Amino acid sequence: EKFLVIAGPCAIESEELLLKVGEEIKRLSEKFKEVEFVFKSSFDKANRSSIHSFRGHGLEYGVKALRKVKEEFGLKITTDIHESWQAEPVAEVADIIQIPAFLCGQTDLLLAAAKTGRAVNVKKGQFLAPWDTKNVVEKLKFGGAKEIYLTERGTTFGYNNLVVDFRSLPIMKQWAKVIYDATHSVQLPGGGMREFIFPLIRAAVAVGCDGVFMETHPEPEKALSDASTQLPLSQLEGIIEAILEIREVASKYYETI
Amino acid sequence: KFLVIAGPCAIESEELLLKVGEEIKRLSEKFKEVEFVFKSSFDKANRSSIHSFRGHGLEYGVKALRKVKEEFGLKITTDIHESWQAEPVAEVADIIQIPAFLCGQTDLLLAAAKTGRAVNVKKGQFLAPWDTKNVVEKLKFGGAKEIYLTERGTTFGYNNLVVDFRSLPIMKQWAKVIYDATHSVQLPGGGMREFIFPLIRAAVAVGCDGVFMETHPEPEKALSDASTQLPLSQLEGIIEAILEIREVASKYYETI
Amino acid sequence: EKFLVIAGPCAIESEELLLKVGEEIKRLSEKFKEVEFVFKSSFDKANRSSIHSFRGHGLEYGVKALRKVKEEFGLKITTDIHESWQAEPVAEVADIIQIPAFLCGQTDLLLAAAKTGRAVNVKKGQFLAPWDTKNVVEKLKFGGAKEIYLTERGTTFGYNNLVVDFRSLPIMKQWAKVIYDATHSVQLPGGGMREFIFPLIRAAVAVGCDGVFMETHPEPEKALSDASTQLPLSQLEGIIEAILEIREVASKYYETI
Amino acid sequence: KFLVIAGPCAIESEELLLKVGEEIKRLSEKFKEVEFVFKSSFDKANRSSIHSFRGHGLEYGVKALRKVKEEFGLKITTDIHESWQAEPVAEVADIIQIPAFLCGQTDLLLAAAKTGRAVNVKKGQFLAPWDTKNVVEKLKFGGAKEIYLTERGTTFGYNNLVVDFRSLPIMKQWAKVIYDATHSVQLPGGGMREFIFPLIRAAVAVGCDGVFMETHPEPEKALSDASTQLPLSQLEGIIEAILEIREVASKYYETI
């Protein structure tokens, strides 16, 4: 099947930053034809730690910038929603509606996403066991979702730390396509983070998944969010080529679910 | 004074909210040194199954709660799930409750703060104690003045929660701490019930400004949390017990 | 029943330090007649993090110092063993043989302790669930132990941190007397530690237990081990009086196991 | 070269150690680029139940192992539980294995180091990756030169272990890292077996210097770890698979 790569800057800092990253993603999509790229960026960071942290430029502006990207590079789009009412307007540009980790259980948000007709990607909450995502998918199908994804982004392990229990990839795969989030899984809520992105991502594809999610920024050192975990845009190509290779050599061993 | 939030988990009917309210009213008259607050949810926004009981709606819920505050003169508290519900609920709710999973949703918090009412934030299972400082700050920025942080357990492996009592003195540095004696023993997704009382005792021995307890006339027949909701008849004894322990232990509560 | 208080310096730094702390424990035993005091001190720290850390003055010396304490103050004694062969010599002075947390599963060490005829106290391993201590007790009875204790000392919660799941006190109580270790439960393997000793200890007695364990040192700031967690000897009396009070008011509510 | 430690969990009989050794010998001849090490315990020192199988003893165990090293010329590794067993075992064992629960017992480590042999320390379920630095240092102080650290999972709530693959590159800073593919999926005190292969693949994709696998002709009839021991017939395929993944992935292993 076709491997999915979801990438983009964490936050829509500006419509300019978006086109910049979009161009590189467009170039990679032309080189890696066996991959399905999806451009990602949040129009709003609805749960920053501090009130003084960057949030976004609004739903209207964000949807507008995301549309420019889709229009100029012909790339699929995905963004996340935080409240039911955002589902409809967001579905006008987003091919995949993403549900935040903390909200993976909110029945109304799930239902709002499902009826749009768009694909849905749920970030598995840090508090959720892998086998309990089964009902999250049941809710979505009930609400009309035909294209569903579950994203592994780590589990709470003590305070201010997340661990990736790779046993979850084959478990969640029983009821949905699985995406490994290479960026948030090494984050420390509130390991040295960055140095582990690449090795864990190798593990993901060795275990087996249907796609990976990576927040990439031209200059992570200057991002308005996830500055310490966003992958430098120049390294994106290398990471991709590498996971496609590992995936290929490992794939014949992938178990049938 | 010492806070005691109690009531049925979900608003199964205005009828139920009145029967439990009656008993709460009676305890209210018996323990003048305790400030009772009636709690009940007009909607279970995150039931595991789509096929579970959510409720009769926000309008019907606010109607029943209003009936309780009128027929018994008891303060009210209910939880909101989306920003738009902060205003309509603040009409009957003396304290707006922020669900544990949503403790980080800035918009939901700012909306709660805007109604001028008191706000009680449930500490997320994924959140470290010291990280609640930022939750309170967001509320102060939004104009909140009476702010409560409630301990309801922390993610411990899969389908399990542990109560790290160190969190009580830690959160107390920036808010009034409430201990949720009911959701702290439930297994997400021990024998639950048998641990409710023992842990409540630990909570007051350590030191907290209040306790949260879901009670139902017939837990077995409850439409939500039927295994962790305390039988109404047992509420009096547990309150009396926590006041006595508090009386003796309070002598040793460390200074913020 | 009679509440048990196990206290003493973490390590037998010197026979002098032992008599110093022993004197205070002797004085407290005379005041708190409803309490059963047991003097504790390890003749060896068999698992320090670094190789350059203090260990002890040997089994022979330690047993000798512990005997002086028992001889001069008439106090019961307890110390821990790390290998089967130490059981016999140690039982000649120890009223209670203690089994280290990491070794709570070592069948031979348990059996060696059990046949001495002395009482046995097992520190519940940081990796052990409360309901799995049931077999640790089964092993001891099999080996001849008639007086058995289980000590709560925290559970692994992420890296370098322990949490106390008080649900364990009523669980382990189903098959043994339970002791709450007020000192090691707030330690950070490899919370601010000290500031939590007293509140958690209050929780323990409120929940209900048969005794508490507290490492106390005249000058914690100078101890050779557990310097940041050992309680100052001058505060011992206050802590005890407080837990006896909380215990009394709470006891009528203790559930029957 | 890449290390592969395999064999039956416990020494059920010299007979069993020879049948598994034969197959290991054959794989040894088939994969010249891999260094096979025969592993088996002469005693299960910490079985949950007193009524479980421990073994036939140290003498009988060292006798069977010796038979394997002679009849097949395969390196040997077994685990020691108390200091006094370091010397007698170092007679047949090329690598002395330190049990996970005992990774911090200074005397057991110094004794293992004294025999001059290679030492493989199992990282305790309670130990943080970076805290293994001290374990290696104790061994160097005791004269150890060939030191291995084995990842076997970390305590995650109750009766469960999780494998934090970040630990591999971290421990690699001060030792050769081995991945225990068998005990990492067992539930202390998921479906275990089904996760053994997937996680082994992750281990080599990340980068490790070797793998540890317990194998038994008939796992179902094994006297220890009958649910997590890999069927002998499957060993060849998994090895071939990890060599292929390694070949491709090794290009990206980060530098220590």
Ligand SMILES: O=C[C@H](O)[C@H](O)[C@H](O)COP(=O)(O)O
């Ligand atoms: O849902 C989003 C994540 O948890 C973010 O990446 C989050 O905003 C990180 O928090 P901080 O505000 O501390 O950067």
Ligand SMILES: O=C[C@H](O)[C@H](O)[C@H](O)COP(=O)(O)O
């Ligand atoms: O078993 C003993 C404990 O774990 C000690 O209190 C331990 O020695 C603490 O370690 P450190 O060597 O780092 O002080």
Ligand SMILES: O=C(O)[C@@H](CO)OP(=O)(O)O
């Ligand atoms: O990926 C992200 O930007 C958001 C979700 O849309 O973060 P999280 O997955 O933690 O909810």
Ligand SMILES: O=C(O)[C@@H](CO)OP(=O)(O)O
């Ligand atoms: O108390 C409750 O009914 C809800 C929140 O309103 O549960 P939790 O505290 O876990 O979010």
Ligand SMILES: O=C(O)[C@@H](CO)OP(=O)(O)O
């Ligand atoms: O109490 C102690 O000195 C030792 C055990 O004898 O430490 P731990 O309980 O951690 O094993």
Ligand SMILES: O=C(O)[C@@H](CO)OP(=O)(O)O
């Ligand atoms: O490998 C094994 O048989 C034993 C150690 O010798 O188990 P663990 O690694 O968990 O200690």
